[PDB]
Design an enzyme around this catalytic site. Sequence first.
Site, PDB file in Angstrom:
ATOM      1  N   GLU A 133       0.819  -1.209   0.000  1.00 23.58           N
ATOM      2  CA  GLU A 133       0.000   0.000   0.000  1.00 23.58           C
ATOM      3  C   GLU A 133       0.856   1.263   0.000  1.00 23.58           C
ATOM      4  OE1 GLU A 133      -3.424   2.243   2.548  1.00 23.58           O
ATOM      5  OE2 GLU A 133      -2.801   0.260   3.257  1.00 23.58           O
ATOM      6  N   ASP A 152      -7.797   3.895  -0.053  1.00 25.08           N
ATOM      7  CA  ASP A 152      -6.436   3.724   0.435  1.00 25.08           C
ATOM      8  C   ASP A 152      -5.602   4.988   0.273  1.00 25.08           C
ATOM      9  OD1 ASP A 152      -7.198   1.067   0.870  1.00 25.08           O
ATOM     10  OD2 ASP A 152      -6.493   0.455  -1.117  1.00 25.08           O
ATOM     11  N   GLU A 189      -7.916   2.672  -4.598  1.00 21.60           N
ATOM     12  CA  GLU A 189      -8.351   1.402  -4.033  1.00 21.60           C
ATOM     13  C   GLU A 189      -7.379   0.320  -4.476  1.00 21.60           C
ATOM     14  OE1 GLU A 189     -10.548   3.478  -5.456  1.00 21.60           O
ATOM     15  OE2 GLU A 189     -11.928   3.973  -3.823  1.00 21.60           O
ATOM     16  N   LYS A 236     -13.097  -8.470  -8.170  1.00 23.04           N
ATOM     17  CA  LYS A 236     -12.867  -7.270  -7.374  1.00 23.04           C
ATOM     18  C   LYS A 236     -12.594  -6.058  -8.254  1.00 23.04           C
ATOM     19  CE  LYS A 236     -11.143  -6.394  -2.725  1.00 23.04           C
ATOM     20  NZ  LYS A 236     -11.677  -5.018  -2.929  1.00 23.04           N
ATOM     21  N   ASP A 244     -25.256 -24.772 -39.917  1.00 21.91           N
ATOM     22  CA  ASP A 244     -25.732 -25.341 -41.165  1.00 21.91           C
ATOM     23  C   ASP A 244     -24.694 -26.326 -41.681  1.00 21.91           C
ATOM     24  OD1 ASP A 244     -24.638 -23.567 -44.020  1.00 21.91           O
ATOM     25  OD2 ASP A 244     -23.864 -23.255 -41.988  1.00 21.91           O
TER      26      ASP A 244
HETATM   27 MN   LIG Z   1     -26.372 -22.310 -45.311  1.00 21.52          MN
END
Ligand SMILES: [Mn+2]
Lengths: 1415, 49
Positions: A47, A85, A98, A111, A1038
């Site tokens: 931090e 923070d 943060e 998160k 297809d």
């Molecule tokens: Mn087709």
Amino acid sequence: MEEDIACVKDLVSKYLANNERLSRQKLAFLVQMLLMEGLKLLSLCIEVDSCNANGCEHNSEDKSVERILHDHGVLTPSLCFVVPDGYKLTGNVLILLECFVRSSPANFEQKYVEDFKKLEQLKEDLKSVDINLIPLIDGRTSFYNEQIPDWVNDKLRDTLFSLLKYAQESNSLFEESEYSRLCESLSMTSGESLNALLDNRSNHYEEVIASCHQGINNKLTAHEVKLQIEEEYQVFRNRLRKGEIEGQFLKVEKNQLLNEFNNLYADKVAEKDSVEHLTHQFKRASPILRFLYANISECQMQCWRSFLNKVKSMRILNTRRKLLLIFDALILLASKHDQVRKKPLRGWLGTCFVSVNDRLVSLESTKKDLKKWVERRQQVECPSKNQILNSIFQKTISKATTALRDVGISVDHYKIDMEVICPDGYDLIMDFDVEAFPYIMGDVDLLKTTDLERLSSLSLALVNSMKTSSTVKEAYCQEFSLGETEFQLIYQKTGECSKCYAINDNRVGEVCSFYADPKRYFPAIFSAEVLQTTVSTMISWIEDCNELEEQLDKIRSLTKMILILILAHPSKRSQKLLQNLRYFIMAYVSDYYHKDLIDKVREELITDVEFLLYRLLRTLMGLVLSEDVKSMMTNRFKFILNISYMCHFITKETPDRLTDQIKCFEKFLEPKVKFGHVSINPADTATEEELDDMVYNAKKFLSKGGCTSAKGPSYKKPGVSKKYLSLLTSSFNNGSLFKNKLTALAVSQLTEVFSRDYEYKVQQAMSNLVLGSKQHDEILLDGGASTQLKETVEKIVDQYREPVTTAMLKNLCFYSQESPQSYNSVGPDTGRLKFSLSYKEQVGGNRELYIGDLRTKMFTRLIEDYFEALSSQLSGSCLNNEKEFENAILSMKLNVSMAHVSYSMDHSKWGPMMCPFLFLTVLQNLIFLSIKGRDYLSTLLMWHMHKMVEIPFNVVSAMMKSFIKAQLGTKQSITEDFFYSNFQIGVVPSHISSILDMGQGILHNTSDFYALITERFINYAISCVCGGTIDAYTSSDDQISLFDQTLTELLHRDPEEFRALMEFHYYMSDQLNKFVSPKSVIGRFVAEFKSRFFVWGDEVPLLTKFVAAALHNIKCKEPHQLAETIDTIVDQSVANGVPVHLCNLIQIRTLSLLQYARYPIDPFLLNCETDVRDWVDGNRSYRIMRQIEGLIPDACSKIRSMLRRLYNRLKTGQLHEEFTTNYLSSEHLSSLKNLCELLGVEPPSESDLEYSWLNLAAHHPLRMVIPTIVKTIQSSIASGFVGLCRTLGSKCVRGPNKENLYIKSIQSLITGTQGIELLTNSIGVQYWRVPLGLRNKSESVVSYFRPLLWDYMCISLSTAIELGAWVLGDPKNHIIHSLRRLYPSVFEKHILPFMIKFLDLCVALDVNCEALSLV
Amino acid sequence: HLGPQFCKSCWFENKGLVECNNHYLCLNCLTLLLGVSSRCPICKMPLPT
Ligand SMILES: [Mn+2]
Ligand SMILES: [Zn+2]
Ligand SMILES: [Zn+2]
């Protein structure tokens, strides 16, 4: 136990950052649990490193936003409580921080998006208080820092893990959940199965499994299945020859097809029209069509207008309207002084002129307002009503010159000729004064490009009008030029939306008015010659017909009319009509077709223009497909197929997304309500009732009473039979198959007024307030942030009803609470796979998309890779492997070459009609000879069965508005009735779980595998019942079926038995979830597969498709990337069918589009002198080399001789590759002469060596809002092009001191030199010839210039390495290893942030010689 | 050897075909394509008699 405690206390006392803070944590710990504080000190180091790296003030005292806002004197109401923070305050700018650390990417991204949600909520909240905040997210996937050494931190973590081996900490504290999350936080899982979960599955799993096992045998013998198939086929044939089952396949008759197509829209189209009457009515159909074929018969004001436009963006003064007024007076005087000398009125319309910001201002208004302004300035105090304006004009021009000089615009380049400022300005300004179609409708022949040119001018005017900033008569206007005249397009609405434009002229007034959409007329902006040429090519296809010669001119006119009509009127209805025309012509030349073909070809058409298009298409087909043609059907079929694919010219984007979203939701919901499983509010915490409905619907889904019933098979009905499923499973098991309050009150009053601006207010109030009572959460919080809320909601509802230890300090540092710990028959205890539904744009119809979070993503990915491994064990499918698809193409070519029957099938509603339960059932009955893994797939499919889908907010808001309007103020649809019935009880649909929904993409490979096994079984049954083999190739949507010789001769000798077999195939496919779509075709000549058409083993070009794709794809990225994209697209097009002339014209059109954007065209952009050899066996580098050879024709020969000798000595001679890597890093201009002297070839003279090209991206890349090799491995089209044009005019290029400036400044500084000549060949390649005297002497603009011969040698060597050594003739992986070896620092930074062989030259010739990417 | 027994122009006639250099044509297609040139519009080769 205290041994390790005292040890870690010694460690933290010796090794620790003592800067100003961490000593406090050290003294707070040493008085005190070991593992927790170890993680705490580690995370605190992370931090502090974060807040010192982001320059933010550390927030240590757990101060939330309310505390920070109270410490500064900002009073805010009750908002969300979030603690950052770090924080940074700069006036009205807040910076929030943060930070979090996560080992699993799932928890990390969760998160990340949660922090995004809380920060956007906070920004929306503080926006209601007018406080601007900027968010910052510090997500660190690792635990590294800059305070404790790496191995020391690893030893610390290992000591924590070794102290975790005890049992006192586990039994005294660290309850199961928190201890598990702590252990997983310090682990290194980074989640291939992850089976370490708490299995507490209830009895419902066994219920569903037994449901898939009851009644089904799946253990039959390979002989009984054949007997059952034979008996079923006998019963089926008998019931068809009786008549209880309707026929589904009809024989083709060209006469009947033509008559059924002509009679289409018989209730609104009169009859067949002649070509002459068609051409007569076309030239006067629409206002835009009236403007065409109408026979319609320096620049001091333009210079002043452009100059004042250039100085308008910098905001020279806080007098916006006054700046506009002063600029209006200046442009008035400029137009006066330019019109008196020699010029006529060019920028006038009559009592109104075009001022700055390309807007029309009426002259009377200008005179009035300027009079008021000068008199108001004269009230305060002699100047005789003109010294004031003269002085202020001097002030403005001086400030403008200063604001343009510091960046180096060099005002003299605008050719202003600043003499128009006269002392008698006030007087000269005050004394200044200036069936319903006016022209003749229809004069131009349909052979000249005049109509296309006028269309291009109009489209360019539209797209340039699209970008009006519209700051603060108010009607804006663009100007579009022509020949003997020039016109003005006026418009009042702004933005990128569709509006109403008016084409006006100065000599006649208003000419046209029409409601158009600006962002759609792109493919005709500069397509002046490519369209005419492609029409000429299409006509030349069928030119040698010998039967249409007396009418081919009419054909050409018709085609050109169709093209101009679809370009001047881009409508989705025209696109759908052309695609249905494609389907029709595909089914026209076949042998059998589907009975529902015509109902699918017919599409509802409005607006009277689509009817004209239909008449044109009908006449064109009647001409080309007349009864007496009987010659070269191939060419005519190709012609009609291209006429159908012409739909690509229209943009594939959606006009309005609300209607298409409603249509997508309708297609999504209709089959569910048709089936009877629409359970609302899935209630993730599973209740018994939804499970009962789920199992009952699963049991119903398996009935599907076959042909042995009384009524018979109900086609197009979802459900799978037990008998056929058992047959399939048994055939697979054995070796047979594969072998605000005031606004609310105003809205209420407006509603009351409408009962007995306000309309939009009432709509917004109903969309943001009524949804609060049904909050079911993005749009709900968005509406709640724009508004007390409870009282207003209650009053609105009344008025509407009247008329009718798992703590927090360790949760942000060590572990996370987002991970699943257990799982049951519904989901991983956190969410039952919630998806969101979105739409994807396509040519004909938009497709659906199911988007999910990372956990769902990885689960579906697991299932997908498992089923892909399963299918790869087979050799039948062709979806994602190029090899099997190539083999399918080869087999298809071989089969068509022998005139065999081909069954091209598409399957309607493949998505909504499939089912995960079907996959689970067909899986639970197979053996999969070689339990772990299989139960995991089973429970994952079960999770897929219990699936939530979030209804989009737009559609539910629209349905709520419609319900309110119906309750206050007509053939309601199914979804409309559904939403109304749901609203009548109070609940609003948020998620609808159902059984009958396979995700469009999220279950791709499993669907492919199911289709593969089912089609293999169907073909096996057909072969065993008739005596002929059938090959199959599927693509999950297809497929194609290829028959053998026996079926071909059977069709040739017996049509009845063949249609019986085909209807039996249809019946068996419908017994499964394989509903054959009416587009299906049984043809012995043409074959369709993956939009690939084959007529005689060859492939149809589909020219218009690639032409439109090339004319469309223009992004807003860096110009060289755009050239790369266009080159790839044109390479593909020339590869498939396109000739060289069209592609050259497309390249020239792109270059012209780039010229319009005011860009310094460089020779390394495009080659538009192609003689087609470089597209078949050439890369882009060879094309650029050819262009440069064309530019400088003498030095290229010498350099090519040098490089030929060098390559010959390299490949099979003395080894030189070892020192070239370092030789190519010195001064290039000297290195050329050095290497020429080393090899013996005469070096180029000074004349042919000073050539250079201007590289604006020499110091830094362009700011399109270090080499490039280390970076490549890491809205609409009109909006993109206009953004490209907007950036290339602003401060886009960067200087060596990291400063921004304009390109015009660079041209100005180049013009301040006496050496260069700026010579181009024919189309504006714009290559310079700077001398070497000033070459990099005093850090001048010569730094941007780069010699041409060096880059030419680079590119020629690159091509010599890539493709042979014949390129040098006269014109008549381990790369990361070399990167790390040569560039260590460049390999460390900007490389791998989340991840001898003769190739070292391929990586050395681009890290220094900044020409291209070369790879 | 040669391909199937069809006229590569009209795609539907299959009775009474005359051999091209490598394929078959019907009599109607032959007398219809004899009026444009002597070269086969598909084979790029001269047509026999
Ligand atoms: Mn087709
Ligand atoms: Zn024929
Ligand atoms: Zn021939």
